[PDB]
Nucleic acid binder design. Structure first.
Length: 10
DNA sequence: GGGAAATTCCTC
DNA sequence: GAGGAATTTCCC
């Protein structure tokens, strides 16, 4: 479950 | 269509 | 172990 680098979704 | 903000990943 | 750097998304 590795999530990439980015701003959370709305 | 461009600019600004948040979280996450890697190094020493 | 703690800190710095990189990438992605939303609004007007």
């Amino acid at each position: 479950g590795r999530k990439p680098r980015g701003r959370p979704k709305k």
